[PDB]
Design an enzyme around this catalytic site. Sequence first.
Site, PDB file in Angstrom:
ATOM      1  CD  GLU A   1      67.068  56.288  55.321  1.00 61.13           C
ATOM      2  OE1 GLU A   1      66.635  56.750  54.239  1.00 61.13           O
ATOM      3  OE2 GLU A   1      66.606  55.255  55.858  1.00 61.13           O
TER       4      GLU A   1
ATOM      5  CG  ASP B   1      57.647  50.511  33.104  1.00 59.10           C
ATOM      6  OD1 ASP B   1      58.735  49.948  33.342  1.00 59.10           O
ATOM      7  OD2 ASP B   1      57.486  51.742  33.195  1.00 59.10           O
TER       8      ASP B   1
ATOM      9  CG  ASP C   1      66.547  44.459  28.983  1.00 56.56           C
ATOM     10  OD1 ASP C   1      66.606  44.935  30.144  1.00 56.56           O
ATOM     11  OD2 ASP C   1      66.079  45.089  28.012  1.00 56.56           O
TER      12      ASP C   1
ATOM     13  CE  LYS D   1      70.731  42.860  27.671  1.00 53.30           C
ATOM     14  NZ  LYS D   1      69.838  42.010  26.832  1.00 53.30           N
TER      15      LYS D   1
ATOM     16  CG  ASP E   1      36.886  34.953  31.549  1.00 51.60           C
ATOM     17  OD1 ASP E   1      35.881  35.571  31.983  1.00 51.60           O
ATOM     18  OD2 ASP E   1      37.028  33.709  31.639  1.00 51.60           O
TER      19      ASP E   1
ATOM     20  CD  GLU F   1      41.187  42.063  37.866  1.00 47.94           C
ATOM     21  OE1 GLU F   1      40.398  41.295  37.268  1.00 47.94           O
ATOM     22  OE2 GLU F   1      40.824  43.127  38.425  1.00 47.94           O
TER      23      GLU F   1
ATOM     24  CG  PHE G   1      42.120  37.667  35.714  1.00 45.76           C
ATOM     25  CD1 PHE G   1      42.629  37.859  36.981  1.00 45.76           C
ATOM     26  CD2 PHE G   1      43.004  37.463  34.676  1.00 45.76           C
ATOM     27  CE1 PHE G   1      44.000  37.914  37.191  1.00 45.76           C
ATOM     28  CE2 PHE G   1      44.373  37.503  34.891  1.00 45.76           C
ATOM     29  CZ  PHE G   1      44.863  37.753  36.140  1.00 45.76           C
TER      30      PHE G   1
ATOM     31  CG  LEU H   1      41.245  36.387  41.204  1.00 35.99           C
ATOM     32  CD1 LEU H   1      41.474  34.908  41.104  1.00 35.99           C
ATOM     33  CD2 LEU H   1      42.459  37.110  40.651  1.00 35.99           C
ATOM     34  CD  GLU H   2      33.727  40.339  42.827  1.00 37.99           C
ATOM     35  OE1 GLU H   2      33.873  41.582  42.723  1.00 37.99           O
ATOM     36  OE2 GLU H   2      32.679  39.793  43.241  1.00 37.99           O
TER      37      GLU H   2
ATOM     38  CG  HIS I   1      34.027  32.440  36.184  1.00 38.89           C
ATOM     39  ND1 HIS I   1      33.922  32.975  34.913  1.00 38.89           N
ATOM     40  CD2 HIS I   1      34.969  31.464  36.169  1.00 38.89           C
ATOM     41  CE1 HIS I   1      34.786  32.302  34.171  1.00 38.89           C
ATOM     42  NE2 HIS I   1      35.423  31.370  34.882  1.00 38.89           N
TER      43      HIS I   1
ATOM     44  CG  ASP J   1      32.533  37.156  37.042  1.00 41.44           C
ATOM     45  OD1 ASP J   1      32.183  35.966  36.933  1.00 41.44           O
ATOM     46  OD2 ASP J   1      33.129  37.771  36.138  1.00 41.44           O
TER      47      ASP J   1
ATOM     48  CB  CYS K   1      31.070  41.061  24.306  1.00 37.25           C
ATOM     49  SG  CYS K   1      30.388  42.737  24.487  1.00 37.25           S
TER      50      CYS K   1
HETATM   51  C1  LIG Z   1      57.899  39.955  36.274  1.00 33.78           C
HETATM   52  N1  LIG Z   1      57.777  38.509  36.249  1.00 33.78           N
HETATM   53  C2  LIG Z   1      57.573  37.798  37.351  1.00 33.78           C
HETATM   54  O1  LIG Z   1      57.522  38.294  38.471  1.00 33.78           O
HETATM   55  C3  LIG Z   1      57.387  36.297  37.150  1.00 33.78           C
HETATM   56  N2  LIG Z   1      58.614  35.603  37.517  1.00 33.78           N
HETATM   57  C4  LIG Z   1      56.137  35.759  37.883  1.00 33.78           C
HETATM   58  C5  LIG Z   1      54.884  36.586  37.555  1.00 33.78           C
HETATM   59  C6  LIG Z   1      53.617  35.937  38.103  1.00 33.78           C
HETATM   60  N3  LIG Z   1      53.453  34.577  37.572  1.00 33.78           N
HETATM   61  C7  LIG Z   1      52.117  34.019  37.559  1.00 33.78           C
HETATM   62  N4  LIG Z   1      51.852  33.026  38.445  1.00 33.78           N
HETATM   63  C8  LIG Z   1      50.573  32.696  38.673  1.00 33.78           C
HETATM   64  C9  LIG Z   1      49.505  33.291  38.070  1.00 33.78           C
HETATM   65  C10 LIG Z   1      49.718  34.296  37.089  1.00 33.78           C
HETATM   66  C11 LIG Z   1      48.641  34.916  36.362  1.00 33.78           C
HETATM   67  C12 LIG Z   1      47.210  34.713  36.714  1.00 33.78           C
HETATM   68  N5  LIG Z   1      46.463  34.136  35.751  1.00 33.78           N
HETATM   69  C13 LIG Z   1      45.145  33.949  35.955  1.00 33.78           C
HETATM   70  C14 LIG Z   1      44.460  33.324  34.809  1.00 33.78           C
HETATM   71  C15 LIG Z   1      43.445  33.871  33.995  1.00 33.78           C
HETATM   72  C16 LIG Z   1      43.216  32.937  33.029  1.00 33.78           C
HETATM   73  N6  LIG Z   1      44.057  31.906  33.279  1.00 33.78           N
HETATM   74  C17 LIG Z   1      44.207  30.669  32.522  1.00 33.78           C
HETATM   75  N7  LIG Z   1      44.833  32.114  34.370  1.00 33.78           N
HETATM   76  C18 LIG Z   1      44.531  34.318  37.142  1.00 33.78           C
HETATM   77 CL1  LIG Z   1      42.857  33.994  37.471  1.00 33.78          CL
HETATM   78  C19 LIG Z   1      45.293  34.919  38.127  1.00 33.78           C
HETATM   79  C20 LIG Z   1      46.644  35.124  37.918  1.00 33.78           C
HETATM   80 CL2  LIG Z   1      47.570  35.888  39.167  1.00 33.78          CL
HETATM   81  C21 LIG Z   1      48.940  35.796  35.348  1.00 33.78           C
HETATM   82  C22 LIG Z   1      50.250  36.119  35.031  1.00 33.78           C
HETATM   83  C23 LIG Z   1      51.292  35.591  35.733  1.00 33.78           C
HETATM   84  C24 LIG Z   1      51.070  34.663  36.785  1.00 33.78           C
HETATM   85  C25 LIG Z   1      54.566  33.747  38.043  1.00 33.78           C
HETATM   86  C26 LIG Z   1      55.904  34.282  37.530  1.00 33.78           C
HETATM   87 CA   LIG Z   2      64.885  47.853  31.047  1.00 37.14          CA
HETATM   88 CA   LIG Z   3      61.608  51.440  33.345  1.00 39.96          CA
HETATM   89 CA   LIG Z   4      65.009  58.266  53.652  1.00 38.54          CA
HETATM   90 CA   LIG Z   5      58.102  53.786  34.056  1.00 41.61          CA
END
Ligand SMILES: CNC(=O)[C@@H](N)C1CCN(c2nccc3c(-c4nc(-c5ccn(C)n5)c(Cl)cc4Cl)cccc23)CC1
Ligand SMILES: [Ca+2]
Ligand SMILES: [Ca+2]
Ligand SMILES: [Ca+2]
Ligand SMILES: [Ca+2]
Length: 622
Positions: free
Chosen positions: A129, A154, A167, A169, A341, A344, A387, A390-391, A450, A452, A602
């Site tokens: 707008e 993505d 990147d 780019k 695990d 997510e 994971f 986490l729930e 956990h 879960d 599994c």
């Molecule tokens: C596009 N890039 C960005 O935005 C980055 N700059 C960010 C992205 C998010 N980053 C993270 N910070 C904390 C937790 C993370 C987990 C994560 N990992 C686990 C997990 C499972 C097994 N393990 C051992 N740890 C569980 Cl439970 C929950 C979460 Cl959120 C996964 C992946 C990234 C995480 C920080 C930097």
């Molecule tokens: Ca790109």
């Molecule tokens: Ca894109």
């Molecule tokens: Ca608008």
């Molecule tokens: Ca896309």
Amino acid sequence: RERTVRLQYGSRVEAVYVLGTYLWTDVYSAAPAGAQTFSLKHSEHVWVEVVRDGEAEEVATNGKQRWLLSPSTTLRVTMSQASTEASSDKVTVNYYDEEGSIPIDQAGLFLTAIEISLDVDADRDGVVEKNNPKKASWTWGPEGQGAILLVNCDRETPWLPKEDCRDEKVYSKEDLKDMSQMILRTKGPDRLPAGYEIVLYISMSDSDKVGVFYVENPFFGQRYIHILGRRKLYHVVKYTGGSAELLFFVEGLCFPDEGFSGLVSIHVSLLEYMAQDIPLTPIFTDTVIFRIAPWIMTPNILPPVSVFVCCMKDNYLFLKEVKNLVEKTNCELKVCFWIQDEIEFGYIEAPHKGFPVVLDSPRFPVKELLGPDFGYVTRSVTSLDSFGNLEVSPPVTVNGKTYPLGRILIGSSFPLSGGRRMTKVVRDFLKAQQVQAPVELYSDWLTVGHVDEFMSFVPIPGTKKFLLLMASTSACYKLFREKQKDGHGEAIMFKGLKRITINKILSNESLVQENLYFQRCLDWNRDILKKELGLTEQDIIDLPALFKMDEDHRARAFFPNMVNMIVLDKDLGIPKPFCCLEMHVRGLLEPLGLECTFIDDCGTNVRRKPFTFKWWHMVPSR
Ligand SMILES: CNC(=O)[C@@H](N)C1CCN(c2nccc3c(-c4nc(-c5ccn(C)n5)c(Cl)cc4Cl)cccc23)CC1
Ligand SMILES: [Ca+2]
Ligand SMILES: [Ca+2]
Ligand SMILES: [Ca+2]
Ligand SMILES: [Ca+2]
């Protein structure tokens, strides 16, 4: 917006006037010594007002009226439309002495009006707008405003092993679909007067958070120009005369975290050249704010879209049952030969675009997940960093406060216990997302640790209500005691999964006391859950569960944890205990319309439809 533009002694002052502002002009300072009065002339597109301390009187174009020179008698110059030619518009002041009606000197103000506006989709309808007044702020709610920006996590082009945002780019026209538009709209003459330039800029802090792009040569072979972002804090804009609109595509690079609220700002300034060796002066500044959309988790109540399953080639018994259950439901299935695990399935949404994002922390990735319209973000570690610990609850209302996207639940230990806890970085990341206000439950009483292992949620089919399923050691002993009395005493349990019978379990006094303490742990959580999710005893079901206490004094499943099940709307994929335990579970869940299906093992991870509720319609706490 008042701006000071003083007249310079016996000289003409040429200036750019930005629409949306208004000038206050001092005429006394430029008057020659001994001048008693002054008069003025002005063009048609310049409303001039003589302001003698408070009282402002509008003045005609060619008025012969004279006012006494005084520092408290000033001018107020206002323009409503942009210039078609550089000068054209002007204000002229003539000065006279005590005896004389012919000007002894004159000072002028030549003006060039332009319109400068950096516009974004602050109203959130998908279209940019014209100059939303609320664009320099971000407010939550259905009646609030502010532009929203996704993280481009993505992979539009799958050659590079990194995501779109890694990147500076843009390779595809598909990449622009994940970006928010920002248009620099201007009106003015063919060129800016000498000494002026328009600069787009960001702060050093916001340089690793945003990426601003431009589409050059859009009528033939299009190329994409990174103009702001990593190592590019400012960019000089090419001013196109007349009515112009420059299209920009902004990308997010960071999720909100500990130290990053989520808000980023992009500015535009009209800089006036003063002299060489001196920095240009920002004569006008327009700012737009963007909030980087948070990563949102999906509860079991949301309808399933596709089931991701990871197992081995020999796990044919598991594969058949999972595929048979996925057949019953109207969703698809994917096989991979750690599943629930390390990864997510969450989502990100903006008024324009929205797609799923996989959070992965490996204790190289997985090809079946990265790609177009599917983001993949990757990360000391205890067994609580998983994971499975986490729930996410279905939407709840807890004493007036609605949580329309539910609340994240994380396993923890008591404050003064000295026990295990999830890493401070993961807890800060989930907390920083805000929209799913995380709650810390007590899972450290379990060997793995956990949530879960003792809880889950199931919907009530054909209704917008759900049930919390809790593991119950008391439900198990009450069931055993009943079967022992009913004649099923010496019947062997887990026949196909020692030689154990109901009589042997009930006789084990030490195991009774362990499960008595484990039920206490379960009830500690039951109270936190009823408190933080607004649950009553009518919303909970107790599934029979049995545990064994290791040397650390923690629980470990005696038989398959039936509470960790696959929820595909009315169809439940419950782990088979190896049968009165199955008939008890069918008796608890099946009358409610939930068809039970016992699986042999599994694990799995289900991708679901996002919530209808747009996160920006929420109102979270500080
Ligand atoms: C596009 N890039 C960005 O935005 C980055 N700059 C960010 C992205 C998010 N980053 C993270 N910070 C904390 C937790 C993370 C987990 C994560 N990992 C686990 C997990 C499972 C097994 N393990 C051992 N740890 C569980 Cl439970 C929950 C979460 Cl959120 C996964 C992946 C990234 C995480 C920080 C930097
Ligand atoms: Ca790109
Ligand atoms: Ca894109
Ligand atoms: Ca608008
Ligand atoms: Ca896309």
